[PDB]
C-alpha cells in the first residue's frame, strides 16, 4: 500500500555522450554507494522524464542490482488509449510508481483513471507554492497516492503537513526531497534556479540557506544540513503521514553527496 522507501534519483544521460559512458557513470554510483554503507539502505531509484525512462532504467538495473525503479511521466501530450499503453509497459518493466507531472490528458485526471493499474500515483508537492493547500488536497481528492517534494531547504513542510492534516483527513505517502549542495553552486546556481519562487519570501530564505551550504566546508556543510533534515523527521514522521526519502545530487552523485545522505539515514530511515 506504500513504498515506504530510500529513492536515489538517477537522472538519464544524455544521449551524445553514449551508453558506454552512461554504464561506466552508473558502475560509478554502485561503486560510490557501497563507499558510504548505501549499498543495501537505497531501494529503488527515481527516473524522471524530460534516453527515455525505459531505456536508461535498463542500463540501471545492469550495474546497481538492489535497486527497484521509480520514475515520472508527463501525461499531457498522450491520449488515455497512448497513456495507458505507456503506463502498462512502465509497469511491466519493472517501474513501481509513477508520478504524473504534466505542463492530452491532465495530471489530475490520470490519478483517478489509472488507480487500478498503477498502485503508487505521485504528485509534485511544493510546500512554499502559493495555494498548494488546497492544490495538494485537490490531488488527493483526485488520487494522488504520494506526494514527492521539491528539494527541500527549510522546514516549511512542517508547518504545510501539519495544517494539511487537521484540515483533511487524507493521508498519503510523502517523499521528502534532499539536495546535496556542492561547492560548485557557488558559480553555476543550478539548485537556487531549480527553487525560485519571484516573490515568495520563505523560498529567498531557502536560497539563502542554499548559497550558505554551498560556501560552507564539506564539514559544517554536512551538519548544517543534517540540522535541517532532524528538525523536518522530527516535525514530521509523528503526524500520520508514511514517510519516505527522495535524495538528489543535481550536480551529479558525488562521495561527499553520499556520505551526507548516510547520515541522514543513519539518524532516521523509513521502514
Given at each position: 500500500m506504500t513504498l515506504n522507501t530510500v529513492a536515489l534519483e538517477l537522472v538519464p544521460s544524455n544521449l551524445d555522450l553514449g551508453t558506454a559512458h552512461?554504464?561506466?557513470?552508473?558502475?560509478?554510483?554502485?561503486?560510490?554507494?557501497?563507499?558510504?554503507?548505501?549499498?543495501?539502505?537505497?531501494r529503488h531509484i527515481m527516473i524522471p522524464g524530460?534516453?527515455?525512462?525505459?531505456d536508461y532504467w535498463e542500463l540501471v538495473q545492469r550495474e546497481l542490482p538492489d535497486?527497484?525503479?521509480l520514475c515520472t511521466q508527463v501525461?499531457?501530450?498522450?491520449?488515455?488509449?497512448?497513456?495507458?499503453?505507456?503506463?502498462?509497459?512502465?509497469?511491466?518493466?519493472?517501474?513501481?510508481?509513477?508520478?504524473?507531472?504534466?505542463?492530452?490528458?491532465?495530471p489530475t485526471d490520470a490519478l483517478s483513471t489509472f488507480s487500478h493499474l498503477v498502485k503508487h500515483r505521485g504528485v509534485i508537492l511544493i510546500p512554499t507554492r502559493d495555494d498548494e493547500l488546497s492544490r495538494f488536497g485537490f490531488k488527493c481528492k483526485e488520487g494522488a497516492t504520494f506526494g514527492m517534494t521539491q528539494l527541500l531547504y527549510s522546514d516549511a513542510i512542517v508547518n504545510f503537513l501539519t495544517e494539511f492534516?487537521?484540515?483533511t483527513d487524507h493521508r498519503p505517502e510523502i517523499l521528502l526531497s534532499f539536495g546535496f549542495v556542492p561547492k560548485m553552486e557557488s558559480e553555476v546556481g543550478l539548485i537556487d534556479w531549480l527553487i525560485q519562487d519571484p516573490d515568495n519570501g520563505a523560498v529567498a530564505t531557502e536560497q539563502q540557506f542554499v548559497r550558505r551550504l554551498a560556501a560552507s566546508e564539506p564539514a559544517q556543510k554536512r551538519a548544517q544540513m543534517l540540522d535541517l533534515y532532524k528538525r523536518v523527521i522530527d516535525?514530521?514522521?509523528?503526524?500520520?503521514?508514511?514517510?519516505?526519502?527522495?535524495?538528489?545530487?543535481?550536480?551529479?552523485?558525488?562521495?561527499?553527496?553520499?556520505?551526507?545522505?548516510?547520515?541522514?539515514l543513519d539518524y532516521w530511515a523509513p521502514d
Open positions: 552512461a554504464l561506466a557513470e552508473l558502475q560509478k554510483v554502485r561503486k560510490l554507494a557501497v563507499d558510504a554503507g548505501l549499498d543495501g539502505r537505497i524530460m534516453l527515455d525512462v525505459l535497486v527497484r525503479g501525461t499531457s501530450f498522450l491520449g488515455e488509449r497512448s497513456l495507458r499503453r505507456r503506463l502498462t509497459a512502465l509497469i511491466q518493466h519493472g517501474f513501481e510508481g509513477i508520478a504524473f507531472v504534466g505542463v492530452g490528458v491532465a492534516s487537521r484540515n516535525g514530521v514522521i509523528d503526524l500520520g503521514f508514511p514517510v519516505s526519502l527522495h535524495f538528489e545530487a543535481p550536480y551529479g552523485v558525488s562521495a561527499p553527496a553520499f556520505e551526507t545522505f548516510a547520515a541522514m
